[PDB]
Design a protein around this nucleic acid. Sequence first.
RNA 1: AGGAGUGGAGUGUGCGGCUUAAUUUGACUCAACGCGGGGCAACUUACCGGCUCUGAAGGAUGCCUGUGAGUGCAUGGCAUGAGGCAUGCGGCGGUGGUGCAUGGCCGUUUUAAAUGGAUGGCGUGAGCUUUGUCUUAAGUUGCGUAAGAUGUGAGACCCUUUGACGGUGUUCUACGGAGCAAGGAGGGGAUGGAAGAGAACAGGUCCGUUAUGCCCUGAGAUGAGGCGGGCUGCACGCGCACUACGAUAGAUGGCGCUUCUGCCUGCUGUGAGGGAUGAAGCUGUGUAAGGGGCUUCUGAACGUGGAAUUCCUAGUAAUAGCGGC
Lengths: 81, 58, 93, 210
Amino acid sequence: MLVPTANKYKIKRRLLEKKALLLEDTVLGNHRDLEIPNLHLKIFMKTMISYGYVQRIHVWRHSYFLLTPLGESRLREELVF
Amino acid sequence: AKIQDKEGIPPDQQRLIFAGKQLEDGRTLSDYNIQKESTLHLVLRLRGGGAKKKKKDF
Amino acid sequence: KVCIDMASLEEKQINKVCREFYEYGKTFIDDLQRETVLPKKVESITTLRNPSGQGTKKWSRYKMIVHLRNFYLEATHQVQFLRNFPHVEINLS
Amino acid sequence: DQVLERFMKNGLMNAELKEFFEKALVNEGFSTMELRMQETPIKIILKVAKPHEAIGEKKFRLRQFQHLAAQRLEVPDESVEIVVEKVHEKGLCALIQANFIREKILGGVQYRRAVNMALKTARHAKAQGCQIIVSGKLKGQRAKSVKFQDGVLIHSGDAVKDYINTGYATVETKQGVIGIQVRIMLPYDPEGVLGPNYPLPDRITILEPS
RNA sequence: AGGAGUGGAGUGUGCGGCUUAAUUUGACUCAACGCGGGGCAACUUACCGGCUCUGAAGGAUGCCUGUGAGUGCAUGGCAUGAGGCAUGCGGCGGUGGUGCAUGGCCGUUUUAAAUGGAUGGCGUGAGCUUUGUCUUAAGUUGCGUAAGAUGUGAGACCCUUUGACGGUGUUCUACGGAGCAAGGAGGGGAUGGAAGAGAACAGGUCCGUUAUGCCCUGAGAUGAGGCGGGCUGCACGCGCACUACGAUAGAUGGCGCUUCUGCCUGCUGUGAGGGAUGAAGCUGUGUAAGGGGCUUCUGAACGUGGAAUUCCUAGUAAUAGCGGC
Ligand SMILES: [Zn+2]
């Protein structure tokens, strides 16, 4: 499906402030803090792995993401003025 | 097997807007009473913003 | 009314914390340098060793033993050198 | 019950958070972790061998571990506190040597020149003994194992829990995974820092009449 | 030497064979067969029959796209508002194949008692340092010998709990130890476990794992859901069990209670022993049940089991039970 563009910029805000994220791998439900379905987050953070912004470390039914230098430096020119 | 196609509205956007003298925009096709003034309801008890919720039969 | 409670999984490091606090509380408001010793608690599980269905079938039971001591010494504002121990699970109510 | 119902949900969290730190601290000499869930800030201590590289400049790399450990434990943002430390003796940790033999096999060295570089780093630190095992497709398509011992070990008994130190590691070559196991015997220490402060149970020493 | 059995009967449930749209599979002397913690109505589930979805990274080339790409609408026109289609290099998913490509962990020889450096000596050299003998659960100790000492394993150690040591007397001994007594809360490794060097096997597991090499598969997908069916089908051969063939017993009452699996007892003198198979009626769990319980009736085979064959040395074997998973 097409993740709505109002939800994409929502996610790129939490990556700047917190610089991390934690995604429980299932299809049902909503994220705890962000009120976005788990199935939108799973579709969108397959493109932040092809670009080279974060790196996934999966452990026990949970995938921990971590921001990178090339990613932190890249999001500045889209959300920083 | 096979699926069904669709039909699009290119110029029907100008439903009843009638550009008259003094830019007298003639607005017809009254919208949903339970929604904003901009969401022109479908003909005969159907609405658009609500998938099928707003149903104003008049 | 102070009430110090201890609990941990290994015992060779729970006796130290119940003896190191023996002398740093000797010369203070409280006395009766002793600590009760309740009977331990046990939790058990039994399972198969074989990771499939081959061989002789062999069982093994695990235990989680938990020791715990008590302290009762009424004082008034007499500590943080109790919170500096690696394994014992200090409790202060 | 009550105490034996929280001591198992507390320990069930130490088994998972310990499983993540050793994957995000691979190339820094990770040694151990320790979790104390009764404080105002939940303490978490990490023993490593590269303190000024796990932290990162400005602590940019430490303020990520603190946010991921707070999401998991279900607490506020500033209610968990990570504290980094440094190992006392780099040569006596069996899990640090298990990965030093593993960064070499990804570095084109052969498994003989790499094993002997990690057996003499246990002699210099004054360890009683040290065994190593390597098993896989070492040099072909038929697999075998090879042992390398350089001292005194001990296998059965009750003191084995205190006197041995274990560590595993696997390398993903172009052929398939290889295994590595390291076991180190710590020296007796009356103070109780390098090794235990216990003599082995079958050592009898007779005093002098003076 | 002894006690209780299995092999014969009727049922419980594993395996082969046959059958089926499908009856998903691994394991075959010990060391496969109430074993995969495998008691399957859905899920579990790997199999069969229809239907629905994409839960399809990102580049590259052609084509189309703000003058609307697509999407929800139980009905066809509004509403939302930026990607889509065609080729390929590639990323990704798979209870899809290979355990004879691997890691990790288990089983087996091993419930055994076996082994590694350095000194001296013996051989041109590899190499050997033997073949005895007493005692022990044990290369456990003791003697004899070109050998004298030190590690791992056994023991100590730990679950675990009163310094109990063959200590004292006694009868034999190779001075290693063994039997029988007393005293004693405990007696001969204090009991039962846990543990267990270094080698081997083409032993078992890719169906346990975001452990893993290579091959196979890719939208009418070997991916993900939803609904019905199957794994429970039945001529026959086999392995582990449960209940019986009766008077040392069955039926009915009383006594013990928050205890117990016992004790006393009017009837039955023998198919009132046994309780399979089926009928009618009442009920619980759940989305779904003649599967699970209860009441009256029906009441089989079975008369202590051929050749073979399994377990067992004391608070144990055998009998009757209660917890937990
Ligand atoms: Zn409306």
